Design a protein around this ligand. Structure first.
Ligand code: QKV
Ligand code: QKV
Lengths: 543, 549
């Protein structure tokens, strides 16, 4: 009843948003027929900002052209959830000396904006507009950047798919039957199709890296508190065991570094003193000195697809030819880190704070049985845990960690994560590494299957638990040779997560594959430096 | 559960006293052999000189690293006979003396360590029986960087049992006494550090802080101490009683005679060595331009926090430093943090005792309970229903005891997240209030003067001026300003307290007969801005004690 009314009123807001967008771009295109839209969109962000700084391209020109593309791609992707109205007034009042002057920036729905709903796919958050912009949006406006639209998220944001009962289902710009990723699926679909040159997204299980790999764009996940989490909307507040991180999303890695340099200014540390005043170290990013790179083709938990395995080896061979030393490195106790530390950290209360948002609301099929399993009693979760332990160890250990704990059990878990963080650093020091090469979950999965393939977060959620800066960059396209070899895929366990993932990665010719890059905590510039190296060797067209 | 007795704890303390006695014997044999070699070496001229002039004469070559070592080592031995602040002498330090890097910033500097800092082949007992007879395999990160910067760690300082008290007494190493007065407490939990530096045994030291453990002994003994942001320095290797507690942030910092030595210690620690060995700490360089800045500051201040009544000595110290800052050219604004009782009663007490002290009481199993902790142990051991029953009964009469006892109850993981979110919301609250008055720095009346023996554990509410900024994770420092006059101690009969419970009665009695004792002031800056905090601490020190600069 209430969920039905909230969905109907949200769709009216979306219709009004798209109608305002369409009438604004036609107003600009007819008044400015001299402007070339094709050369505008193909132009990289680094070439875009210098033409905006000099005055070759007006802030009005770059804004409504990208807005025109954003509205056109939304027809087949359904990624834009709300259009920000007062963006046209911000355009005229943009600071010239800002690093991102006249840059249209897409925002995830969790990023609160003045006079806009941060629904997150829930009914209780619908009809509650934010009365103030969040710190990271504030500094974008202070740095000249103009946020234009909000992007769609999956219900509750706790899934790497992208669908909600309020605004609908987001689709991959490359293939209709495929998921655009999540929970920044709206960001991936928009930037991947060329609707936005720059974007922002959150991450706690891989929410930046998933849609970036699925759509073929670059996304960075910084350390827990490298950027301001103030003003950000979520379902569970106070979860510190698994570190939540917000980061940039763009077409190329060079655009991510300029975004990070802009946000890491005086204005961020003034508006949020809780974030350490770490400036963007240009010296570390621009570095060309040979790196000692750790690598692994598989984490022995989730079997990589033929497209993933080929992408990891090709990057390795290109880096070896460049002069970088590649050393086989694998983190200790990975299944232990995912099953009881990562899953136990996110669900220490049994999901009781999480399920509070689902009271009197529809459940989206993209989540799957995620809600039905969490609603089970603590004794019923434990009973099925030791019963299915000899059958499938993955589902059993995950279900036991989704049980409610006490305050004593949380500290025991918090200390174990602190011990695990130091243990991997001990291995990082012993092997003497600068950066880490990791396969990224690819290619794009089918619609309503990511929620049923839980184990696939293994390559991403590990570095949320570790709180390591992780970033992804598209390196190759899925050749029909790789898609054919998906028939020999079986998995190490053969449980439901391996069965669904086998079917979901099929029929994926033309989809992009990315590779994950991991550096030591607080080293975002070093992570981006390696991301710059991987991109240059694999896709020389960019940069 | 079956009682194991105290027999295991008795033998552990017997072996702990021996390690203390043998240390002093090794210290005595070392300083006597040096004095026979150097008869014309001036000791009083060596000790009186500040660390800044000491490090300059060590870098130039005027004074040998051996000369400054054995002079301070002998002074540390002499003051220990009246203070009892040294637990153990680090045997492998004379080898480090010759191995100390000449180009290091702290070259040839004798540095005292708190027992929580783990040293290779040395016990970090913390006052507990189970922690003794358990030597550390390697030095901790912050001790490693001291050795890399040329500093020579030589002694472990005394701590109260479990470190959860601002007194300083343990059943294994004994009781620490204030170098200024015998009957007075030297502070805690870095009470050994305060007593050693305050008397002149150590020019520089390190200590932990989660409720004011750097700031308390600094004010009680009359020395400078800085508590930075929780994650500004490495916590790796630091031994504690409880692990996994992230609600209230644990912080570590420098302790010295003057403020200029604290900034040199922070600059030496903040180097490539620290960030490599512990990547969890952000690579923030020590901003010299901020510390050396002589620009006028917008300073917030308050005479009282409306929770714990300041002594006439505290009131006088706060006003005197406030007025002299105004004469310098600084603008002083009446500022008070919102909902202080909320931060202490339910956020700090609830954060530190989320499990009801269940992991904390694990260390006290079959071990002695030191009188300096008071009834803290007996209160924690009570069941959840008994803690709740007394909370409802004491609420109408004693509001402070009701909220503290209720927050010391075991809760679920759901309630911990709500609490941890309430802390970061409160952190954003005071930050928003900070901007509203557009402050640069904050001035707080630090708890003073020194309390009596075995009274700090019975006067819980006194941590109100210190634990507030552990909950807020604000870098706070302490600098001595003035001593107690005959008029200050005489006005203690007029002292009553804002609540009139047992905490105000004991604190009234504990601050009596305090003529001559030092009283300090607290300086608070915004998170991650401890270099700005020291800049203000330098301004306070220069205007109140110009002889230190
Ligand atoms: C975005 O970071 N994101 C959060 C949820 C996610 C991945 C997508 O990570 C944790 C998790 C845990 C379970 Br039991 C099921 C699904 C996810 O997905
Ligand atoms: C060192 O920071 N330190 C820890 C214990 C202390 C002060 C000294 O702070 C917390 C606390 C809590 C209670 Br209920 C009683 C006493 C203290 O002291």
């Amino acid at each position: 009843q209430k969920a039905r009314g909230a969905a109907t009123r949200a769709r009216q807001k979306q219709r009004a948003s798209l109608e305002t967008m369409d009438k604004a771009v036609q107003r600009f295109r007819l008044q400015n027929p001299d402007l070339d839209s094709e050369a505008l969109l193909t132009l990289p962000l680094l070439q875009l900002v210098q033409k905006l700084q000099s005055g070759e391209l007006s802030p009005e020109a770059v804004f409504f052209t990208y807005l025109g593309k954003a509205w056109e791609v939304n027809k087949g992707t359904n990624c834009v959830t709300s259009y920000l109205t007062d963006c046209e007034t911000q355009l005229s009042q943009a600071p010239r000396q800002g690093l991102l002057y006249g840059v249209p920036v897409s925002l995830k729905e969790c990023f609160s904006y003045k006079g806009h709903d941060s629904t997150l796919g829930l009914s209780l958050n619908e009809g509650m507009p934010s009365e103030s912009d969040c710190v990271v949006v504030q500094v974008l406006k202070l740095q000249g950047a103009v946020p234009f639209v909000h992007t769609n998220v999956p219900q509750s944001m706790l899934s790497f798919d992208c669908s909600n009962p309020l605004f609908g289902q987001t689709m991959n710009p490359w293939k209709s039957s495929k998921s655009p990723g999540g929970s920044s699926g709206g960001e991936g679909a928009l930037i991947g199709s060329g609707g936005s040159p720059l974007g922002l997204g959150t991450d706690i299980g891989g929410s930046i890296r998933f849609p970036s790999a699925f759509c073929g764009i670059c996304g960075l996940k910084p350390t827990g508190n490298r950027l301001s989490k103030s003003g950000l909307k979520g379902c569970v507040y106070g979860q510190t065991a698994v570190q939540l991180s917000l980061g940039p999303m763009a077409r190329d890695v060079e655009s991510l570094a300029l975004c990070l340099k802009a946000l890491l200014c005086e204005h961020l540390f003034t508006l949020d003193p809780t974030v350490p005043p770490l400036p963007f170290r240009e010296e570390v990013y621009r570095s060309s000195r040979p790196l000692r790179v750790g690598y692994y083709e598989t984490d022995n938990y989730t079997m990589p697809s033929p497209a993933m395995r080929r992408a990891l080896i090709e990057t390795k061979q290109r880096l070896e030819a460049a002069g970088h030393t590649l050393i086989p490195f694998l983190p200790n106790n990975i299944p232990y880190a995912l099953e009881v530390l990562s899953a136990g950290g996110l669900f220490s209360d049994g999901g009781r704070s999480f399920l509070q948002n689902f009271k009197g609301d529809f459940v989206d099929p993209c989540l799957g049985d995620l809600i039905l399993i969490l609603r089970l009693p603590s004794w019923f979760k434990r009973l099925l845990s030791l019963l299915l332990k000899p059958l499938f160890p993955r589902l059993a250990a995950f279900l036991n960690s989704m049980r409610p704990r006490s305050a004593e059990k949380l500290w025991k878990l918090q200390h174990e994560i602190e011990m695990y963080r130091q243990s991997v650093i001990a291995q990082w020091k012993a092997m003497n590494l600068d950066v880490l090469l990791t396969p990224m979950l690819g290619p794009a999965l089918d619609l309503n299957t990511p929620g049923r393939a839980t184990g696939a977060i293994s390559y991403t959620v590990l570095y949320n638990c570790l709180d390591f800066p992780a970033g992804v960059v598209p390196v190759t396209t899925v050749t029909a040779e790789d898609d054919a070899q998906m028939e020999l895929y079986k998995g190490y366990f053969g449980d439901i997560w391996d069965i669904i993932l086998k079917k979901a990665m099929k029929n994926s010719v033309g989809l992009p594959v990315a590779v994950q890059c991991v550096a030591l905590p607080w080293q975002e510039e070093l992570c981006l430096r390696f991301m710059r190296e991987v991109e240059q060797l694999m896709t020389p067209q960019k940069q």
